[PDB]
């Protein structure tokens, strides 16, 4: 019953394409989608090439 | 005064002082009357009953 309140979730990844994370609630039933992409500004993997 | 068909009164020369006296007298009388009033006061949660008092 003594359950902590989760504020943020950090994922450590080594190789990943763009993907989505689905959030579901067992009481309200609402669904939330958080879309993640591998494009981050100023990084090496930002060229239009590949 | 020169070129005037009618004269002027003496109280015209001290109307300002008379008005100041009137204002100060009104202020002091009003303050005395306002302080003369009584209103009483009891603290909430008095632990006492006013009707018996």
């Amino acid at each position: 019953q003594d359950v902590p309140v989760i504020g943020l979730v950090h994922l450590n990844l080594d190789r990943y394409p763009d993907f989505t994370v689905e959030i579901t609630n067992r009481k309200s039933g609402a669904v939330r989608v958080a879309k993640a992409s591998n494009r981050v500004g100023g990084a090496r993997n930002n060229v239009v090439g590949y | 005064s020169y070129g005037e068909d009618w004269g002027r009164p003496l109280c015209e020369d001290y109307s300002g002082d008379l008005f100041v006296v009137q204002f100060l007298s009104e202020a002091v009388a009003r303050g005395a009357a306002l302080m003369a009033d009584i209103k009483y006061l009891i603290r909430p949660g008095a632990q006492t009953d006013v009707e018996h008092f």
Binding site: D18, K35, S37, R39, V40, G41, G42, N46 | -
Partner: protein, 162 residues
């Protein structure tokens, strides 16, 4: 394109509008703006609420033959998205930005301009017509030939009684 004209009469209280583009056709709810036609001026309306994605709901039914106009005004001073290095770069912003930048031009094609607008240069139309004018009241207003016909009619009657 952007602007949509609608007429109201009866118990009807919900009006539907459709804009060009993907999905709902707009980016923000703030882009929707409602106008009411009083018959003389471009008066704004109050008491409207956005009930659906592409529909609005009034509090009271419109009167006989009331005319409303649902248009969409986009941000006129800044781009929709601001890009910096080191940020979470998502592709949806790119798609939205192009639509928004395409959107700012869209109503210009329709014919809307911001208030306090005047062409300060000498414009030319390359020998094209100017049509559909009202008679001008003040001297600064332009005149159609309906007034010219009236003046031509006026000089005729004075000459004929001569």
């Amino acid at each position: 394109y952007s602007y949509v004209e609608r007429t109201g009469d009866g118990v009807a209280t919900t009006f539907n509008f459709a804009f060009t583009g993907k999905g709902k056709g707009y980016l923000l709810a703030n882009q929707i703006y409602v106008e009411r036609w009083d018959g003389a001026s471009w008066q704004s309306a109050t008491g409207w609420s956005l009930s659906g994605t592409n529909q609005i709901t009034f509090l009271t039914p419109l009167a006989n033959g009331q005319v409303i106009r649902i248009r969409r005004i986009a941000g006129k001073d800044y781009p929709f998205a601001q890009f910096e290095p080191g940020v979470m770069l998502d592709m949806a912003s790119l798609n939205n930005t192009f639509i928004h930048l395409l959107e700012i031009t869209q109503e210009l094609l329709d014919g809307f301009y911001p208030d306090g607008f005047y062409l300060k240069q000498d414009l030319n139309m390359g020998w094209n017509k100017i049509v559909n004018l009202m008679p001008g009241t003040d001297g600064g207003h332009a005149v159609n030939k309906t007034q010219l016909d009236t003046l031509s009619s006026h000089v005729d009657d004075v000459d004929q009684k001569h």
